[PDB]
Write a protein that binds this ligand. Sequence first.
Ligand SMILES: Cc1ncc(COP(=O)(O)O)c(CN)c1O
Ligand SMILES: Cc1ncc(COP(=O)(O)O)c(CN)c1O
Ligand SMILES: [Cl-]
Ligand SMILES: [Cl-]
Ligand SMILES: [Cl-]
Ligand SMILES: [Cl-]
Lengths: 439, 435
Amino acid sequence: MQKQVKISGKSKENMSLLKHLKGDVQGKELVIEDSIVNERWKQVLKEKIDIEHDLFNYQKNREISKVPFLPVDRLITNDEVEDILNTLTEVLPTGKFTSGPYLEQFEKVLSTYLHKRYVIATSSGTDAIMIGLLALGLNPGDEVIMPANSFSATENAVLASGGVPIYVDINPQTFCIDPDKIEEAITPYTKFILPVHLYGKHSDMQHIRQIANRYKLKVIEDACQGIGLTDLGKYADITTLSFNPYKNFGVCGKAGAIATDNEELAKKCIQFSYHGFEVNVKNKKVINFGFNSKMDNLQAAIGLERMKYLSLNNFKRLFLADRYITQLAELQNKGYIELPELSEDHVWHLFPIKVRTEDRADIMTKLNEDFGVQTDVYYPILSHMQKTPLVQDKYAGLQLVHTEKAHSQVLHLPLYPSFTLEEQDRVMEGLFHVIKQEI
Amino acid sequence: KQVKISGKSKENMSLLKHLKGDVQGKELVIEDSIVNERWKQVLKEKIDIEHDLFNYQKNREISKVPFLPVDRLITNDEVEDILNTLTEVLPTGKFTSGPYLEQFEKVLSTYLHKRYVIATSSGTDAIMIGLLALGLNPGDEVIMPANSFSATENAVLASGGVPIYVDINPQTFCIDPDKIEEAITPYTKFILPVHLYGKHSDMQHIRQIANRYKLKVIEDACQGIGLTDLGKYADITTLSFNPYKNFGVCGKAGAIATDNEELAKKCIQFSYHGFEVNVKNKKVINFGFNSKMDNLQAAIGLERMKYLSLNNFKRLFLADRYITQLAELQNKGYIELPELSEDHVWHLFPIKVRTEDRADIMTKLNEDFGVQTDVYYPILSHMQKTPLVQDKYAGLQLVHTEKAHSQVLHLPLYPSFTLEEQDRVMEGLFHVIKQ
Ligand SMILES: Cc1ncc(COP(=O)(O)O)c(CN)c1O
Ligand SMILES: Cc1ncc(COP(=O)(O)O)c(CN)c1O
Ligand SMILES: [Cl-]
Ligand SMILES: [Cl-]
Ligand SMILES: [Cl-]
Ligand SMILES: [Cl-]
């Protein structure tokens, strides 16, 4: 009796798929979930697959002299462009670019994909967080517990709506908020915990929800880099997503989403997202104010096209990350670097290794100068280290030991779905070469 | 001798006079501007406006006149320009930041005669960021009218500002400068006039008051693109490029324009996460937003902007045709018509009817003649049913605003509207009012 292998495109299921697509028999046991996110799989999976050749067109003998970290022209493929041009041919003459039926359809599709009853699509991930906090009842002075290593948009969303960030240390291996440091930071002004699934890695949400239940806190998660994570939002009151062009799934402009199972909360999000108006009643305010922060109908139509590539693209990211972890194994075994763990709760938006603090600048310089290999560090400045009057006045004396140590060690290697395996070879070879010459 | 064509409201008025036989000079000179590009394909020496710009079909069968059919606010010609530019934009993979964004800001700068332009994700965001850049702190008071779209007050409230509502001039629908000083308190920091319906507020008088009391002036010109001397007396000028404006993109966008460099710097910092200008991830102020205009929309706007001068002129022609053709209804005192003024771009066309008759007029136009009208906007700021209003604005009376609010009626007016539809609107109004 054969166990079926459900292809949802989610992170846990992709992990089994990786094993099966590596093997010789790829038959009826592989069942493609009837979803828009799986559309590009449908055609690919009609035949037996060799991953290297069929998904990556591996050309080991193609000479490579430069490896850009993130060439944006390669983040969108010719087939996506043709798809998008086709849909726009129909959307443009409708004259509906802000409100419209593609926006509504896009929200339903996300709702089904996320298993969340209500989805409110927004004009950015930053707006989603900001509106989410307000809809959850954030008042000026309310404290929000969060990590200090996220992109600046996370703290800005708290600050913009009047909140007070309270920074807490991360787990230095996962780069996510350490749930064992959270309870320490709770005061009578704490109302929120805002975990970030940094680089695509899922935070320890079950533990976080336990602390939150204990102290009656609300949980809003920044999953802007985590689309595709299995069980996303299971333990959160609000989930926020970004669809900016650099994400695992993005549109052609700024956009994001709020997702929730709570109807009263959803309604408030809608009200905040559109001028404080009663839902579907233009010009009639039912709350003090709101923003102009719904997603555009035009981007929604674009999103319905690009979403067709998501499951395949997340799978290719997983393959790339597995290949890094396996081929670089020796550098970790001998204790020169730390590799991320090949886990089910990661969608590989970014790929972090850790190197020695004292060597990082030189490792980066040598990869670039000697081998044309570009790497990067997301993000260069920690929240409590920003040179702002707020930080200077209120965040002096703060020490986050693990966060600061990890921040000095982390190095991101190129990884995106249209990256080639032969570029990756170059990255890995160069890494072996420069690390060995550090010793 | 030369009749210069800028596309701006004053020159448009002289062009109109000139083309109606009232000669203003000899040689038509089309200024070399992006906003005039499409004018060049239709504007000839012996132009017949009714035929050459409107393709007037006196006898075309009409059974409905929609107030604002959104599919007709973008032409087939625009759709093709847009598809063509997107064919080149899409493969670059640059959709947020990028070179079209920078070019679009440059082009707006030249057109508006403002040194710095910061293109934003919406007009609402432009106002919000402009207020903050100008130094709005929570509790600071902002003098403003109560008859604008809710976006204006929301931009103040979102940053914790405090709206102070003042009465309007009931003929112009704009903030009455003679009611401003009255409302000034030690907490007042800004005046925020609105060029409502596309009518220019009395900015000179407003600036005199501002200087006297050391206030800042940020104007909501989201409906006023094309006004001659827009921003001459303002510290910050805000625009919207939403698809319903005199010029719009294909999504949300707006702009802040200013001549002040330090202000511009602050606007950029607030518009993008509080980062140092052009230096990602390095904050120099406490926080910012994700509120720049998208590169993709700027590519679209660079195409749609080519139709602006032509479209604004068409709006003027329509407004002038309404005012001339409906004259009798005003002469006999049945309605009031807007004044044919150089300082208007006719985003909306407001007439005034009797308070007690407006509902019936609207119903009879629609039911008997399929003529749809509307009222922008249905609810005044101090009459919204919110907790802030009940706690802060209780008992406020704005006599002229409230009266005008009960009287105003908007007639269909947009660049692609037809003269045959307009005839139906006008004959309908005559037949309804007589009866
Ligand atoms: C962790 C994180 N949170 C929030 C955001 C903000 O998302 P958006 O750009 O759609 O505003 C980003 C975008 N880089 C992000 O990476
Ligand atoms: C007078 C006025 N002010 C501000 C705005 C807000 O502009 P946007 O829709 O681009 O946010 C509008 C849009 N209707 C407006 O009409
Ligand atoms: Cl929904
Ligand atoms: Cl730092
Ligand atoms: Cl500029
Ligand atoms: Cl009202």
